[PDB]
Design a protein around this ligand. Structure first.
Ligand SMILES: *CCC(=O)N(c1ccc(O[C@@H]2CC[C@@H](N)C2)cc1)[C@@H](C)c1ccc(C(F)(F)F)c(C#N)c1
Length: 147
């Protein structure tokens, strides 16, 4: 459900921003996701450096527009797979790093807005495929957890 996906998206943004939230800590799914998505994010940052250096992410609306353009390109052939879902989180990590650095009126309460639209996209466009492929615990974690 939305709340579950929003918590994954929020946890990943907090991981990239170096602000882990105090308390019981991230779930097993979140821990596995942070590891795989961060690895994909680092690869994307290097491989698409010229492409990422040409944008100025001055606002949440600018980040939303950029994210939608990436999603149209990522899923243009209509196929969904777990590697593509991990790539969504990798792009939200890149967007929050650019927003911290380039946002016009830096607003600490706008990192949750990026997490929100990423969760809306995941739920609306990939949610049914995720559920049919086992959800996060029986699908995602089984595929990507350490061997
Ligand atoms: C380089 C083209 C470009 O400026 N661009 C863009 C980046 C990435 C894709 O598609 C991904 C790579 C190929 C597929 N696997 C998906 C498409 C277009 C823009 C729209 C862009 C630049 C920078 C960012 C950044 F992350 F830095 F904020 C985004 C985003 N989000 C998009």
């Amino acid at each position: 459900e939305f709340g579950y996906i929003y918590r994954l998206a929020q946890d990943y943004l907090q991981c990239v921003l170096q602000i882990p939230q105090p308390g019981s800590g991230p779930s097993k799914t979140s821990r596995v996701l942070q590891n795989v998505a961060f690895s994909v994010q680092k690869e994307v940052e290097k491989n698409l450096k010229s492409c990422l250096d040409n944008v100025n992410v001055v606002s949440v609306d600018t980040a939303r527009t950029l994210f939608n353009q990436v999603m149209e390109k990522e899923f243009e052939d209509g196929i969904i797979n777990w590697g593509r879902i991990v790539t969504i989180f990798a792009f939200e990590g890149i967007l929050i790093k650019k927003l911290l650095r380039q946002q016009i009126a830096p607003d600490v309460d706008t990192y949750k807005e990026i997490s929100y639209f990423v969760a809306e996209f995941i739920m609306n466009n990939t949610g049914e495929w995720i559920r049919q492929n086992g959800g996060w615990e029986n699908g995602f974690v089984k595929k990507f957890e350490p061997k």
